[PDB]
Amino acid sequence: MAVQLVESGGGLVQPGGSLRLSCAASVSISRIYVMAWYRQAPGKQREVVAVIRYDGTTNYPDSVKGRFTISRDNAKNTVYLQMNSLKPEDTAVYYCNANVETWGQGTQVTVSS
Amino acid sequence: MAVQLVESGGGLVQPGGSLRLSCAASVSISRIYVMAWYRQAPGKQREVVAVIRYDGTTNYPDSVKGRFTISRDNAKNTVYLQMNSLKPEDTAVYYCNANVETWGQGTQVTVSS
Amino acid sequence: PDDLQRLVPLLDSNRLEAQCIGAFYLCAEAAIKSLQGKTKVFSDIGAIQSLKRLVSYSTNGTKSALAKRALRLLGEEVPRPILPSVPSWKEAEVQTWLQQIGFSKYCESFREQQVDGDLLLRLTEEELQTDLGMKSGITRKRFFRELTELKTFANYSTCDRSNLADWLGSLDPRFRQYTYGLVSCGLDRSLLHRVSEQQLLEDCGIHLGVHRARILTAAREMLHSP
Amino acid sequence: PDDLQRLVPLLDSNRLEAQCIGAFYLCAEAAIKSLQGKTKVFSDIGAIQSLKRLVSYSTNGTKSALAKRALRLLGEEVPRPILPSVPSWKEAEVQTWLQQIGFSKYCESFREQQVDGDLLLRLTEEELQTDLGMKSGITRKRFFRELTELKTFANYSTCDRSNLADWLGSLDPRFRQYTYGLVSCGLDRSLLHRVSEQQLLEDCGIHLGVHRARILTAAREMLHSP
Numbered sequence: 001m002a003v004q005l006v007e008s009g010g011g012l013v014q015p016g017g018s019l020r021l022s023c024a025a026s027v028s029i030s031r032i033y034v035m036a037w038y039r040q041a042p043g044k045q046r047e048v049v050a051v052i053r054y055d056g057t058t059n060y061p062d063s064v065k066g067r068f069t070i071s072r073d074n075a076k077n078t079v080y081l082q083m084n085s086l087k088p089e090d091t092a093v094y095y096c097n098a099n100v101e102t103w104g105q106g107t108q109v110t111v112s113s
Numbered sequence: 114m115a116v117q118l119v120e121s122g123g124g125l126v127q128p129g130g131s132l133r134l135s136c137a138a139s140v141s142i143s144r145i146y147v148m149a150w151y152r153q154a155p156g157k158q159r160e161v162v163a164v165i166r167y168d169g170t171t172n173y174p175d176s177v178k179g180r181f182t183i184s185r186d187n188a189k190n191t192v193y194l195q196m197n198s199l200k201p202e203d204t205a206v207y208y209c210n211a212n213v214e215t216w217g218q219g220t221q222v223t224v225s226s
Numbered sequence: 227p228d229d230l231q232r233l234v235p236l237l238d239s240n241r242l243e244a245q246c247i248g249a250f251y252l253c254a255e256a257a258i259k260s261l262q263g264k265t266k267v268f269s270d271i272g273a274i275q276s277l278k279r280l281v282s283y284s285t286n287g288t289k290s291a292l293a294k295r296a297l298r299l300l301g302e303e304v305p306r307p308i309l310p311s312v313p314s315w316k317e318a319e320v321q322t323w324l325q326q327i328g329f330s331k332y333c334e335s336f337r338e339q340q341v342d343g344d345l346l347l348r349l350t351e352e353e354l355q356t357d358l359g360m361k362s363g364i365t366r367k368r369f370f371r372e373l374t375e376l377k378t379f380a381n382y383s384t385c386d387r388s389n390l391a392d393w394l395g396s397l398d399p400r401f402r403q404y405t406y407g408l409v410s411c412g413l414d415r416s417l418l419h420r421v422s423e424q425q426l427l428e429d430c431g432i433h434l435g436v437h438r439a440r441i442l443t444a445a446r447e448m449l450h451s452p
Numbered sequence: 453p454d455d456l457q458r459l460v461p462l463l464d465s466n467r468l469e470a471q472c473i474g475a476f477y478l479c480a481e482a483a484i485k486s487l488q489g490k491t492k493v494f495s496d497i498g499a500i501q502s503l504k505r506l507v508s509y510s511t512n513g514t515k516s517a518l519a520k521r522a523l524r525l526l527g528e529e530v531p532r533p534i535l536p537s538v539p540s541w542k543e544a545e546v547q548t549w550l551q552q553i554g555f556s557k558y559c560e561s562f563r564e565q566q567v568d569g570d571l572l573l574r575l576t577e578e579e580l581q582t583d584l585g586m587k588s589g590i591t592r593k594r595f596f597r598e599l600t601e602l603k604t605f606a607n608y609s610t611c612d613r614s615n616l617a618d619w620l621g622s623l624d625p626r627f628r629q630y631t632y633g634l635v636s637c638g639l640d641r642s643l644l645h646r647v648s649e650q651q652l653l654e655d656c657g658i659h660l661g662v663h664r665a666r667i668l669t670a671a672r673e674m675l676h677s678p
Contacts, residue, residue: 352589356589413662417666424661428661
């Protein structure tokens, strides 16, 4: 019953440039109420970067509006995050989150030469 | 009617390292509402380190979460405490406690060379 | 065949009647094609994916009932939503929920008072205003908007024996939010039928008079069923 | 034999019906195998340990009654819980209880006022807020949650002659918490049947209207039994 989430993507890029992260679940995503992406920088606490509900209405924080985009894919159970214009401070470990309780394991993302 | 508790274990170990303490009662443990382990350091007052109810739900203080573990054993009437990663300040006399009133006699535990 | 593909996006319509007739047609030909061996057309045309989609999170008795009848004729299993188990939460989940809804500036106060799921679902305006620090009525109104959105989409199975949540949802989907106030106070489906309005006001925490009246009439109508 | 071992973990089930039928079977074959000499199968298969386990702390009339009938057929004695004798406590036990529940930051105040078990079981919100120092309503709500968990699991035998606690527990296990408010005020099982609601509100300290109503109807139904 306990859903398992697995992430993919990550790694490193240059300042300016896009990337796409994927998060795959054990069941149909269309049953889950909310799903979300979270970001934890070294030396600080977690924070949200995108959420999406069962009806596909999404909320973004003001920090990353226009630069990120979250979407469900119903073909294979996978939620995508698209990161278009990157800054140097957007380097952290990223986590996938089901309803509230269940977490993923995270993927490291870094931006430099 | 008055339940008697007897402890076992104790002694001394090195910083880092595990130990297991046992507490045996005069009746079936499965009749007792709550049981608990207490810790009194020299020069201070007592404090709790683990509790467990009749239905086996346990609460730990924030100081020792992840490092200790309390369990009932229904084969022989005995509650166990498992101490996995030890610090130098975790040296004290330990007591076993039935419902609230009845106490044990305690066992000394020390951590050094 | 290819004719069935034209009836595949029509279900996405905004109006009700289009959805109703599309479901009636597909379910009727499923019942027709069910006794023979050819059930594989529903597989390779991909209509089963849209049906398994739309059955969860739908408050429409006709279309959902028809979709359930269609699925259960093809020998499949109906999905069910995966809702948060709010009333068994701890402080960590409460704080990440506060990150999620956007009230991240209050995560400190909700940590000091050690608010958890059972205490979260029983908050009033005095606890918000006095000691949690939400002074402005606009902010409390936004918070309660978010809370009542959460409460209608929770999972009360670990504490609701008599299945009160479905009984409240059958009246109106907006009413499911009250279920925890009815259970923690002690009620259930059997002994519900003899409660007064004045007990519904301060014990169950129902504030709108209209909801009290509708709940009272719908309960009192189910008078002595056993 | 080995067939009986398959019915040994089934009792751990979450649902009620599985537990009920397992108990019916085991008790029925115990009654069958009881008149002959072979009663030693229950010994060496270890089912008696699970039966002696589950009889205490169980609010289920059918399964507990069946377990009691099974045990009393094998000539054993039923266990009984070992509950704290709260209403005869002193300040030392009150303070260690405060260590146990996690409210250790208030152990000073509860020592200065010399709160003991009789005074602990009769606390209101004014004594908490004004002089014990629990200012925030959230903290008082957590404290009362813990207190009402303790009060339902206490041992009132030293002060309850008419066995009022079992009468309250037979209605609803949540109701046992009120027993001390009924005894210190003076009531008992015989003269209970002519109390008014307005006497239940401020003397016995019952606050929820639903509990007052259920207690009133259940008492008033037992009108003139002697």
